[PDB]
Amino acid sequence: YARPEWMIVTVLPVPPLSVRPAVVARNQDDLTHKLADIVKINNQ
Amino acid sequence: YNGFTGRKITSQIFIGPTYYQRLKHMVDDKIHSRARGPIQILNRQPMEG
DNA sequence: CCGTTGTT
DNA sequence: CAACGGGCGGAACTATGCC
RNA sequence: GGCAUAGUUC
Numbered sequence: 001y002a003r004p005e006w007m008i009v010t011v012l013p014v015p016p017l018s019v020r021p022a023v024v025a026r027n028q029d030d031l032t033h034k035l036a037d038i039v040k041i042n043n044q
Numbered sequence: 045y046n047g048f049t050g051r052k053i054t055s056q057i058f059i060g061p062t063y064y065q066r067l068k069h070m071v072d073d074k075i076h077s078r079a080r081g082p083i084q085i086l087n088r089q090p091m092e093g
Numbered sequence: 094c095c096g097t098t099g100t101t
Numbered sequence: 102c103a104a105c106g107g108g109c110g111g112a113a114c115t116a117t118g119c120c
Numbered sequence: 121g122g123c124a125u126a127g128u129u130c
Contacts, residue, residue, distance in 0.1 A: 021085060023121060027120080069129070074114075085121085093114090 012038070 020031040028036075045052055082091045 025121085027122080069114095074129095 014035060015031065020029045020035075022028070078090065083089065084091055
């Protein structure tokens with residue numbers, strides 16, 4: 001159930017749209033902003 | 045004297061003009077009830093307020 | 094304030 | 102002996118500024 | 121719509 005090497009994150013789960021809902025003018029959550037920054041750095 | 049029966053009250057009462065105040069806290073601004081109303085978005089629990 | 098971990 | 106980290110009440114009601 | 125701050129009741 002917990003292999004030691006799995007604790008090194010190489011695949012990052014993305015929570016669904018229910019965990020980070022949009023805001024009604026559409027606003028993005030703190031999680032969404034951090035996800036966008038992370039994927040920006042990752043593709044760079 | 046008693047109001048309903050008209051008979052004297054045995055104990056004499058202490059009565060006089062005192063200066064009273066009506067505070068801001070009324071009941072029409074505090075009564076509240078709920079039965080299956082609006083519901084929060086993130087948790088899908090009832091709203092607050 | 095006081096449970097962990099390091100340094101000595 | 103020294104440094105570090107987590108822990109610290111319960112409910113409720115208005116208002117105002119800002120993203 | 122949300123975040124924050126202030127005041128008040130018990």
